[PDB]
């Protein structure tokens, strides 16, 4: 649903962790007195169906235009012309529909500052922050990394307004497998799946 990377900040310690990935929960809360219509799926589905109506109107308009062009063009090579233009119009219609679905189902939140990347990635499938039930921690068994990662996860939940008394269950795979220096995220992704 989401995959992001980040850097921390300015400092003189290369291996020292940081909260840079906390930006994945970045959200604006200056005016949240009322809920976004954009976070409501019925609203997004309404916009999608309106766009679908517009797309089919556009497709029939382009179809009658192509019919007029086929009337104008000589009938000798009409079949090849019609087939080419039908493939073209089909591709255009499908691209437009996919664009509407991208606008209202997948990337409805990429421009919204009051929807964080984390919350929006969940909300594409109707999941709320509370539905993020498990966190595969890096969990290296070092002091700085474990404290920093717990603090980052906690700040993400606090800012995204996760329900109180609903801690994410932290899975630490490296107690068993150990730390590979780059297979680590892949092993944790396997475990998460």
């Amino acid at each position: 649903a989401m995959a992001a990377t980040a850097t921390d900040k300015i400092g003189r310690s290369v291996p020292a962790p940081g909260k840079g990935i906390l930006t994945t929960a970045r959200e604006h809360h200056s005016s949240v007195k009322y809920a976004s219509p954009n976070l409501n799926m019925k609203y997004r589905k309404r916009q999608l169906v309106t766009r679908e109506a517009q797309i089919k109107d556009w497709v029939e308009n382009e179809l009658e235009a192509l019919k007029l062009e086929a009337e104008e063009i000589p009938s000798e090579d009409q079949n090849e012309f019609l087939l080419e233009r039908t493939r073209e119009i089909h591709n255009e219609a499908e691209s437009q529909l996919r664009a509407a679905q991208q606008q209202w189902g997948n990337d409805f939140y990429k421009r919204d500052p009051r929807i964080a990347p984390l919350r929006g990635a969940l909300a594409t499938y109707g999941l709320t922050i509370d539905d993020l039930g498990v966190a595969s921690f890096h969990g290296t068994s070092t002091k700085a990394n474990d404290k920093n990662e717990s603090a980052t996860i906690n700040e993400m939940m606090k800012h995204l307004g996760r329900s109180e008394g609903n801690p994410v269950i932290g899975v630490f795979q490296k107690f068993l497998t150990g730390h590979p220096k780059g297979a680590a995220g892949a092993w944790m992704m396997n475990g998460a799946l």
Binding site: K9, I10, G11, K19, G20, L22, T23, A25, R26, E27, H28, H29, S30, S31, P113, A116, E155, H159
Partner: protein
Amino acid sequence: NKLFVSKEHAPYTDELEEDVYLDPLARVSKDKKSGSLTFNSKNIQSKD
């Protein structure tokens, strides 16, 4: 011989680091005292 100017400090303080990270609309402003571009609380999580 100062084309490379190393930054001593990040544009946010440690206490405001998380707030800057969590605000997508936070932007640095020129500080009246220091004269450098830094993050400011009145600009972090502000309605303007």
